[PDB]
């Protein structure tokens, strides 16, 4: 509803509309999803486009995207996205990201891992030295 919120939605739209032609195609959607560790079928991509495509021209313009984003988005600002990402990453909900939870996230998002890379990511974020990443430590890594 705020321009702060609309601008943040506009930035996300720009991540799907790579060619900048003001529309998201089934091809652009699949491209993004295949970079995110997903493997959608054509039928799945078509089903997701039709559900959002209000005028029925077969692509998603910014007004259609904004409508979709407004229904079940929350605040959807830079801080809120970092919080929702932490809540997904903290699988057991204790308020700490463990090495096993980070491995699960990397696998989920299509990122190749090693124990040494995970150990180094925890080491560089772990301000209080408890061997896990809390919300404050996660923020500091992400904002900066």
């Amino acid at each position: 509803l705020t321009e702060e919120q609309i601008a943040e939605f506009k930035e996300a739209f720009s991540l799907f509309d790579k060619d900048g032609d003001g529309t998201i195609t089934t091809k652009e959607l699949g491209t993004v999803m295949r970079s995110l560790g997903q493997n959608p079928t054509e039928a799945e991509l078509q089903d997701m486009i039709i559900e959002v495509d209000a005028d029925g021209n077969g692509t998603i313009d910014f007004p259609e995207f904004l409508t979709m984003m407004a229904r079940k988005m929350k605040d959807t600002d830079s801080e809120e996205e970092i919080r929702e990402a932490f809540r997904v990453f903290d699988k057991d909900g204790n308020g700490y990201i463990s090495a096993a939870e980070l491995r699960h996230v990397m696998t989920n998002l299509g990122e190749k891992l090693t124990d040494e890379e995970v150990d180094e990511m925890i080491r560089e974020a772990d301000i209080d030295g408890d061997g896990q990443v809390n919300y404050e430590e996660f923020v500091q890594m992400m904002t900066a």
Binding site: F16, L36, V52, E81, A85, V88, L109, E117
Partner: peptide, 21 residues
């Protein structure tokens, strides 16, 4: 590497958008 933390945030933001479709 901080870059990989950033990569994970950017990827998770995109998955959160994909889930609204």
């Amino acid at each position: 590497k901080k870059a990989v933390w950033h990569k994970l945030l950017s990827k998770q933001r995109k998955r959160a958008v994909v889930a609204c479709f």
